[PDB]
Design a protein around this nucleic acid. Structure first.
Lengths: 59, 249, 233, 121
RNA sequence: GUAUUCCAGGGGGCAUGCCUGUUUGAGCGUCAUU
RNA sequence: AUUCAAUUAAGCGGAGCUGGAAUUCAUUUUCCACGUUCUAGCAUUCAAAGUCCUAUACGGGCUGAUCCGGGUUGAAGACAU
RNA sequence: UGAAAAUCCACAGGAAGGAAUAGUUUUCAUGCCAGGUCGUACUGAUAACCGCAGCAGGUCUCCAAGGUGAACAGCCUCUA
RNA sequence: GUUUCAAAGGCCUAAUUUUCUAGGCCACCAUCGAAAGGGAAUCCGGUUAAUAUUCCGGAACCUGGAUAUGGAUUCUUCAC
């Protein structure tokens, strides 16, 4: 029977995780998503090129 | 005479385990699809001291493939693990310290612990402090690897059975002497009621076979047969050798 | 088109929660369901004797339909039609006094096991129809051997329920004919000659051969694979 | 043929049409009259020398109450019999094994005037 | 007492095993019909 | 049959795709692989595609997730009990 | 390496629901009604308990002043 | 023996506005066990031959019900 302004602070994860915890996991969540899109860039370029490279072995 | 201490431990009134500060049954994950074929990610969050156990435990968080949920499993920590570390369990999992592999996808001369006797046993062989199982041999016909247990006696185990890589943590526990008797008390205080053991020869002839007589002597041979009965078996049971052994065990 | 976006899920072992599949194969049934399904299998795997094996030789779909078209004629009275007949009886007896010829002579199919066995024993029954799924087989197993000795046409047929439907019953077990009208005698003898080819003529043949000894799917592919590698290497 | 599609690997009891009661004869025959009446709850007015001192000063009249009597029931009983609006009820069980109910009335009704009407004073 | 849901008061009900029937059902255990 | 173990009885056994290829050369002839490994994030109410309609509001069928046998799976076995 | 569960709260998540001639909020300010049942005296010991009894025995706890002195030691006072 | 080789259920919203029917989700499981463990919320002053955090006077607080006034929020909106 207390107001929830006293229970919580106004931020993302609020009254559960600390501010420096939210600091890091935003930086992680962002930076991993940048690395995950490069997994396409490496494979799409190489695996498509592998079909050209493997055909040279037959000729 | 009376029922001897030997005989009356199996009743289980006082002679029972003290499971107050015991964390949980230290076991492996269940089998099937995910770890049969591929592998799964797991994150070690805590490394805990279990009460009355020479082994620091580890609690790893895995996902449920069929639900939006999380199931924690209590692993025995091998010396090398740390909190905030990834673990890889399955057939296709790689060979590192902590990772759980089946015996078939492992080369000869490797080191492991918490090994299953069957597949789906959830652990049995080599769970104590500073112990580890070594893989020797292999077979194509009959999925059955050759394995050496830490006592010395070798054993044939199925190839699909599991084993966590590395030596079990908390090693060199036996090296320090206990000194004062109060240190020994606190060891058995968090296990069973098996300590202050009186010598059977000091007792009366009613309470124990060796007991009785004007001088404290046994009287007859302490080497007792395998084909005996409960009450008689107090001494060396089915002994091949006696006396001081030299070097080779 | 513009604001809409595609999003593939990927169910590659570790990635994503798996979708809803039909797991009808992996359901834990009740104990009574597991009993009746395993009782089917236990009889098939063991070698069944020739006396039990002959009930598998059932009447085919095309021939059977003609038989029950015949036997739905010469069916017994419904409870209302018996009450109709007894009112006619009471009228003629009071004013007339005539039993034995009045309310004609009924032509009707014979049923009941103890009732039918006596007709076969005195060479009276022309056609007989035996059920394939009686609870103890001991009840109905000896009837094929009895009809052989006396030279009576007989035919095993599916559904003890279907024999019950033509006689106002839940289950009948057996159903035989004796008396029949002269108009429908031509069609009856046509069925007997068709029946005797399968059942009565092949009694000495059916007595010899054993049934059973049929393995499950995992056992079949194990034997076929093992036979291929060693012999045809 | 064509099986019922089912996602779960469990098999539970299918809920069925649960039918209600509809008897051919009554078990009781005659419904019983009121077990606890207005007159049966409040039995006697207590006339000890201490109780006279409370009636004058405290504006509170005291009763000997039967066992199996709630403070809801005693509030209803005094309200019905003597036609008075009750403020509060306090109850205790005596050492001899009989319940006693202290009852305080509102400021409108004087406890001394109603006391001389009932019998005692 | 402002009341399908909250509070109190007066009255009537809710155990287990087994039998006979009634109504809903479960199972490619199995039969005929589209 | 009897015995032992595990799960809320999910992915058993065999064929088929695309495989990528295989070298007697593309094959009704076999081997051979299957979507995640710098980081203590995140993953749930079933979406795109085509097909029609509910008259396009809000949503129905077929795919996305292949098909066929309903033996839950693995020991052990005419020994043991 | 020094209990468990009832119980209460917070966050992620976006289900469903809403306006202007009117509508949402009862985790805030005020205001209204109700709160059952049983225990409640006194003793707790050189006299209310157990020990044949008003028996130098035995029986779990809390509060705790001044001076001397290391001191909850011994010896002497105040309140009761 | 107490979760097992059992077909082991009780929690929310409408539909219907006869108050009886429809939506749904979710699922190895009785019940007893502490007046020193856990635990919703009360204090001062007065009064009796003998009772009080329990009666009287004065000032508070919690849980469960009902509910309407003020304030806040709203042209792009669930505050800055």
């Amino acid at each position: 029977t207390v107001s929830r302004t006293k229970k919580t602070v106004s931020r993302a994860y609020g009254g559960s995780k600390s501010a420096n915890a939210v600091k890091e996991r935003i930086v992680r969540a962002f930076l991993i998503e940048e690395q995950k899109i490069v997994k396409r860039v490496i494979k799409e370029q190489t695996e498509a090129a592998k079909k050209a490279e493997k055909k040279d072995a037959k000729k | 005479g009376r029922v001897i201490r030997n005989q009356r431990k199996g009743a289980g009134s006082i002679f029972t385990s003290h499971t107050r500060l015991r964390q949980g049954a230290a076991k492996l994950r269940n089998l099937d699809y995910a770890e049969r074929h591929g592998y799964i990610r797991g994150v070690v969050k805590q490394i805990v001291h279990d009460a009355g156990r020479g082994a620091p435990l580890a609690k790893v968080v895995f996902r449920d493939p069929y639900k939006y949920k999380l199931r924690e499993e209590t692993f025995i920590a091998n010396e090398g693990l740390h909190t905030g570390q990834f673990i890889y369990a399955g057939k296709k999992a790689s060979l590192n310290v902590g990772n759980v592999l089946p015996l078939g996808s492992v080369p000869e001369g490797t080191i492991i612990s918490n090994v299953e006797e069957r597949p789906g046993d959830r652990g049995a062989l080599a769970r104590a402090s500073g112990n580890y199982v070594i893989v020797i041999g292999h077979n194509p016909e009959d999925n059955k690897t050759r394995v050496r247990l830490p006592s010395g006696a070798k054993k044939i185990i199925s190839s699909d059975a599991r084993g966590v890589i590395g030596v079990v943590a908390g090693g060199g526990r036996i090296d320090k002497p206990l000194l004062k008797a109060g240190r020994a008390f606190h060891k058995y205080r968090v296990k069973r009621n098996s300590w202050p053991k009186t010598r059977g020869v000091a007792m009366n002839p009613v309470d124990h076979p060796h007991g009785g007589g004007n001088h404290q002597h046994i009287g007859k041979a302490s080497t007792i047969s395998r084909g005996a009965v409960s009450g008689q078996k107090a001494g060396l049971i089915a002994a091949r050798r006696t006396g001081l052994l030299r070097g080779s065990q | 088109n513009p604001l809409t976006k595609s999003s593939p899920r990927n169910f590659g072992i570790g990635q994503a929660i798996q979708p809803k599949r039909n797991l009808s194969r992996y359901v834990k049934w009740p104990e009574y369901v597991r009993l009746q399904r395993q009782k089917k299998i236990l009889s098939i795997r063991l070698k069944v004797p020739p006396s039990i094996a002959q009930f598998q030789n059932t009447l085919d779909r095309n021939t059977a339909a003609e038989t029950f078209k015949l036997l739905k004629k010469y069916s017994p009275e419904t409870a209302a039609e018996k009450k109709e007949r007894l009112t006619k009886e009471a009228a003629a007896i009071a004013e007339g006094k005539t039993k034995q010829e009045a309310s004609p002579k009924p032509y009707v199919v014979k049923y009941g096991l103890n009732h039918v066995v006596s007709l076969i024993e005195n060479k009276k029954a022309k056609l007989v129809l035996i059920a394939n799924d009686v609870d103890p087989i001991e009840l109905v197993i000896f009837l094929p051997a009895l009809c052989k000795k006396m030279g009576v046409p007989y035919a095993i047929v599916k559904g003890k329920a279907r024999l019950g439907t033509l006689v106002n019953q839940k289950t009948s077990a057996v159903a035989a004919l004796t008396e029949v009208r002269e108009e429908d005698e031509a069609a009856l003898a046509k069925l007997v000659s068709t029946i005797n080819a399968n059942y009565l003529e092949k009694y000495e043949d059916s007595k010899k051969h054993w049934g059973g000894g049929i393995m499950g799917q995992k056992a079949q592919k194990k034997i076929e694979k093992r036979a291929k590698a060693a012999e045809s290497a | 043929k064509a099986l019922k599609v089912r996602t779960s690997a469990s098999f539970r009891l299918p809920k069925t049409l649960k039918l209600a009661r509809s008897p051919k004869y009554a078990t009781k025959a005659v419904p019983h009259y009121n077990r606890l009446d207005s007159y049966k709850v409040i039995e006697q007015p207590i006339t000890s020398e201490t109780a006279m001192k409370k009636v004058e000063d405290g504006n509170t009249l005291v009763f000997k109450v039967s066992l199996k009597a709630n403070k809801y029931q005693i509030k209803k009983a005094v309200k019905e019999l003597y036609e008075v609006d009750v403020l509060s009820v306090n109850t205790l069980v005596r050492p001899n094994g009989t319940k006693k109910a202290y009852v305080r009335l509102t400021a409108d009704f004087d406890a001394l005037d109603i006391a001389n009407r009932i019998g005692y004073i």
